[PDB]
Amino acid sequence: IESRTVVPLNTWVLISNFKVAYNILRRPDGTFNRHLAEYLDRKVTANANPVDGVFSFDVLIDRRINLLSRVYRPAYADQEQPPSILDLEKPVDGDIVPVILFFHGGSFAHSSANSAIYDTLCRRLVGLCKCVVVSVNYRRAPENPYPCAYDDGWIALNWVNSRSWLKSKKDSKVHIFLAGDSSGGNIAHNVALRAGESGIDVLGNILLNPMFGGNERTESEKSLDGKYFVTVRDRDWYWKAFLPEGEDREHPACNPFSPRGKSLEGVSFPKSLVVVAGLDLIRDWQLAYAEGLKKAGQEVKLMHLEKATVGFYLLPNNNHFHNVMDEISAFVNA
Amino acid sequence: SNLDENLVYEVLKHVDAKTLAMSSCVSKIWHKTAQDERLWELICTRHWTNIGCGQNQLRSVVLALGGFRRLHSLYLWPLSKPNPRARFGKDELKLTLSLLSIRYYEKMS
Amino acid sequence: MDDELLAVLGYKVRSSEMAEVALKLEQLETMMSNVQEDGLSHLATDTVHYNPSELYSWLDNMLSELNSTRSVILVDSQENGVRLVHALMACAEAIQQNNLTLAEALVKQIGCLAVSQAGAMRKVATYFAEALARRIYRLSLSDTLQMHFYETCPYLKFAHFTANQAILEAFEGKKRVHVIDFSMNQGLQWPALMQALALREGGPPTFRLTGIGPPAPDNSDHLHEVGCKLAQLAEAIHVEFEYRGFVANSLADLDASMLELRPSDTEAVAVNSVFELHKLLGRPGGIEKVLGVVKQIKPVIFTVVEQESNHNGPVFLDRFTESLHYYSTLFDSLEGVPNSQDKVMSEVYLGKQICNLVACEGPDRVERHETLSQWGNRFGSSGLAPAHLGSNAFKQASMLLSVFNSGQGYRVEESNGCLMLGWHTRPLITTSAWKLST
Amino acid sequence: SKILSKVIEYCKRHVEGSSDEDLKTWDSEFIKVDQGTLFDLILAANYLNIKGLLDLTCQTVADMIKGKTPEEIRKTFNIPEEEEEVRRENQWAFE
Ligand SMILES: C=C1C[C@]23C[C@@]1(O)CC[C@H]2[C@@]12C=C[C@H](O)[C@@](C)(C(=O)O1)[C@H]2[C@@H]3C(=O)O
Known part of the structure; x- marks a missing residue:
């Protein structure tokens, strides 16, 4: 009754359907119904025929862990015929070319790179930002709890930084922008930390409703509880499934600014673009993350949208989506 | 020491699956009493909370295709090897028995 | 809308x-x-x-x-693979340009590159050059081979179990049943279905089986031999059985009169066909005659298992390009499988598939694969409405990919009421069930 | 006799939910005293045709048998074609 007047009907239907399906798929004793989840998941396949100026193809980055990624590129305007197999890994022509390394959401347990909601998002990112995207297919919980995703991200980044056909003619280097959605945003942050420690130079970071939490109950959790598609019960379920055994929600993977965590002072970090939804159950944690970035001596551009729920970026029927896309495009081509 | 047939049928009753098959390799008398398919009948029946069919038809069919020991060893153990938490249901029984019937048909010539 | x-x-x-x-x-x-x-x-x-x-x-x-889509997956390789693909695409265009002089050198060129190459690409290059070699000169065991494809590759077991569930679901509530196997082969699908009707709630029905096979001096009695063993199985589980074999050069040589069908209300009919309808597209008008007979049978279900690719294009280098990608994925899936005589005879089984794909033409070429989009267009015009597959069939296929295949990356997906088996994100085969539109 | 007095002090206790846990503690003390004579306590039970005591006394032996290697199971109660045949037929237990 309260969520109907804040989102369009199609968005309401999509999010409510996802919520009821995930309610069905969650079992109280900490086990997941994987077969039914994969049966109910809607997916697509890679296409080398350019559709609306974008074509994609899959690459098997790793075979021991079955790590895979999907590459989205703009259509070759110079040529007329559709690209061949050799034309896929063709060097880019341009003084500067940014590549976005994307991680998808799902609270470390749902969805995949082949899903029909993240493929559309990656195609739209290519179309609007005028870049190339690499969408990673990382392992999921509770079968692969931790730190499987944080290792898949590192391997994918090491692969992306080595492609000689992705280098730029200005300085013979690859310009990588880490991007993440929900839990993927979480992963993005952590991956950026690792990229800070090694020689890889990530230039930017984009977080869309990053997934962070804590032991204490913030005022948003108490006031907003079950009002907009999210409850603290399933949040705690997912944190229990993802996190290791015998650890609380103050683990650094949950809250980056915990006392057991690591300090961001005297640490090289990319400039951050954090988009925080207003009508979110965990809005206080995201605002605290932005404030900790500001007070840690780092750069961050906070984008707090007052009347934004979760999943506003999955359909182009709201002003928030257009504003966020324009800000991402300006952040990338800078 | 030495135990009678019904005595082994009682002591080797409360040993579940792994330890029974362990005890199939120790003593010749316990070897014969472990080849008995009623212990394995109980073992396999424990894996299911509701098979969905009467036991009278199930026992004859399973013993006609090779027995419960082979059904457990060949197919059920793969299905329980990664995680023993999950309890088998309709689909697991159907899959394992179909594999058993196909294997019985392979030996048929 | x-x-x-x-x-x-x-x-x-x-x-x-x-x-x-x-x-x-x-x-x-x-x-x-x-x-x-x-x-x-x-x-x-x-x-x-x-x-x-x-x-x-x-x-x-x-x-x-x-209460047209081109799915491609790039596995790690070397530039010598690109030199191989460049050489392979050089000969296919040269042989299509009626050159027939550069082709001999180009075919020889592929041979010298393949020895240096290592991995699965050496096998694909060897089998495509050989089929390219004896195409140039054309303008200028079997029972054990399909056996070896069973314990090594998961496509046959996926086809049988997934089709059995659709047949089993449609048989509930019936007292007499009759299934016709267009791909009778050695009858490995049916022993698993017979035990499912024995444990069926309400009582097993009277099971009747009729198989159709390719002509041979021995396959006429091999079909008789198969039913000898199925008759002994139906008595161990107390199922009433009946059998009748067939010999036919092609499925287009069939008619509904000689199948000896009782009224459909008395006996329920279910038609089955696995990897058989693509061998019928070489004959002009073949597929429309067979689909007009299935409608004459009036079954309750018709399960079709095929291969997901477009290998039936009107342009040679188009067929050459898609087939090279598809058979590169197949040889990549088998790369990690432990070496065995079953594995060796599996590549020969597929090598004969590649060789018939590009060397032959007209009715001699039987590997006229099509996609579910194209296949669904043919069935829809006949009058066969889809019968959707449920999650019970999906579940068993997923556990099937866990008993025999452990580390290999095979996945199951649902699409338009169908099931697909593929390697990682690349579909390979598809299972569909159809019913008469009412 | 000793096993006769044992079955009296078990079965009048049987005559004499929350009672089963301390009953099983008394049974632990029992099979501690009933040790050694336990195997012949099976023969005494067959002499008497007991039901509850039979299950309870077989349960203790079964609880022992769990998790011992072949020769371990040997030396607890003092007990090559067939050897390799049983090893290969039950390899999954050893795998
Ligand atoms: C249990 C969940 C998970 C939600 C919130 C919800 O409470 C119900 C709706 C889910 C969701 C549905 C699809 C998208 O993957 C997601 C990111 C979203 O926006 O909304 C999904 C989103 C999330 O991943 O946080």
Whole structure:
């Protein structure tokens, strides 16, 4: 009754359907119904025929862990015929070319790179930002709890930084922008930390409703509880499934600014673009993350949208989506 | 020491699956009493909370295709090897028995 | 008309049904608040779900119970693979340009590159050069081979079990049944179906089987031999059995009169065909005659298992390009499989498939593969409405890929009421069930 | 006799939910005293045709048998074609 007047009907239907399906798929004793989840998941396949100026193809980055990624590129305007197999890994022509390394959401347990909601998002990112995207297919919980995703991200980044056909003619280097959605945003942050420690130079970071939490109950959790598609019960379920055994929600993977965590002072970090939804159950944690970035001596551009729920970026029927896309495009081509 | 047939049928009753098959390799008398398919009948029946069919038809069919020991060893153990938490249901029984019937048909010539 | 913004996301919802669907969702929520965990468990393990894309039907079920595309995957390789593909694409265009002088050198050129090359690409290059070699000169065991394809590759077991579930579901409520196997082969699909009707609730029916096979001096009696062993199995489990073999050069040589069919109400009929309909597209008019006979049979289900690719294009280098990609994926899936005589004879089985694909023409070429989009166009014009596959079939196929295949990356996906088996994100085969449109 | 007095002090206790846990503690003390004579306590039970005591006394032996290697199971109660045949037929237990 309260969520109907804040989102369009199609968005309401999509999010409510996802919520009821995930309610069905969650079992109280900490086990997941994987077969039914994969049966109910809607997916697509890679296409080398350019559709609306974008074509994609899959690459098997790793075979021991079955790590895979999907590459989205703009259509070759110079040529007329559709690209061949050799034309896929063709060097880019341009003084500067940014590549976005994307991680998808799902609270470390749902969805995949082949899903029909993240493929559309990656195609739209290519179309609007005028870049190339690499969408990673990382392992999921509770079968692969931790730190499987944080290792898949590192391997994918090491692969992306080595492609000689992705280098730029200005300085013979690859310009990588880490991007993440929900839990993927979480992963993005952590991956950026690792990229800070090694020689890889990530230039930017984009977080869309990053997934962070804590032991204490913030005022948003108490006031907003079950009002907009999210409850603290399933949040705690997912944190229990993802996190290791015998650890609380103050683990650094949950809250980056915990006392057991690591300090961001005297640490090289990319400039951050954090988009925080207003009508979110965990809005206080995201605002605290932005404030900790500001007070840690780092750069961050906070984008707090007052009347934004979760999943506003999955359909182009709201002003928030257009504003966020324009800000991402300006952040990338800078 | 030495135990009678019904005595082994009682002591080797409360040993579940792994330890029974362990005890199939120790003593010749316990070897014969472990080849008995009623212990394995109980073992396999424990894996299911509701098979969905009467036991009278199930026992004859399973013993006609090779027995419960082979059904457990060949197919059920793969299905329980990664995680023993999950309890088998309709689909697991159907899959394992179909594999058993196909294997019985392979030996048929 | 559907909702364009949601149809892109994989959901078929009418624009005029939106409110209704939303209302249903509200209702569902309330029930899940009342019935609570136990009821939700019933929704997970005791329910079979059909066609998740149709939100109206899925929500109705839950409420009632609570009350040209080119898919390519690049595996790690070397530039010598590109030199091989460049050489392979050089000969295919040269042989198509009526050169027939550069082709001899180019075919020789591929041979010198293959020895240096290592991996699965050496096998694909060897089998394509050989089929390219004796095409140049054309303008200028079997029983054990299909056996060896069973214990090594998972496509045959996936085809049998997934089709059996669709047949088993359609046979519930019937006292006499009759199945016709267009791909009788050695009858490995049917022993698993017979034991399922024995344990069926309500009592097993009278099971009748009729197989059709390719002509041979021995296959006429080999089909008789197969039913000898199936007759002995139907008595161990107390099932009434009946059998009759066939010999036919092609399925187009069939008619409904000689199948000896009782009235359909008395005996239920289910037609089966696995990897057989693509061998019929070489003959002009063949597929339309066979699909007019299946309609004459009037079955309750017709399960088809095929290969997901477009290897039947009217241009040679088009067929050459797609076939090279598809058979590169197959030889990549088998790369990690432990070496065995079953594995060796599996590549020869596929090597004969490659060699017939590009060297032959006319009726001699039988590997006329098509995609589900093209296959669904042929069945739809005949009058065969789809029969959707549920999550019970999906579940068994997933556990099937866990007993024999452990580390190999095979996946199952649902699409348009069908099931697909593929390597990682690359589909390979598809299983579909059809019923007469009413 | 000793096993006769044992079955009296078990079965009048049987005559004499929350009672089963301390009953099983008394049974632990019992089979501690009933040790050694336990195997012949099976023969005494067959002499008497007991039901509850039979299950309870077989349960203790079964609880022992769990998790011992072949020769371990040997030396607890003092007990090559067939050897390799049983090893290969039950390899999954050893795998
Ligand atoms: C249990 C969940 C998970 C939600 C929130 C919700 O409470 C219900 C709706 C889920 C969701 C549905 C689809 C998207 O993957 C997601 C990121 C979203 O926006 O909304 C999904 C989102 C999330 O991943 O946080």
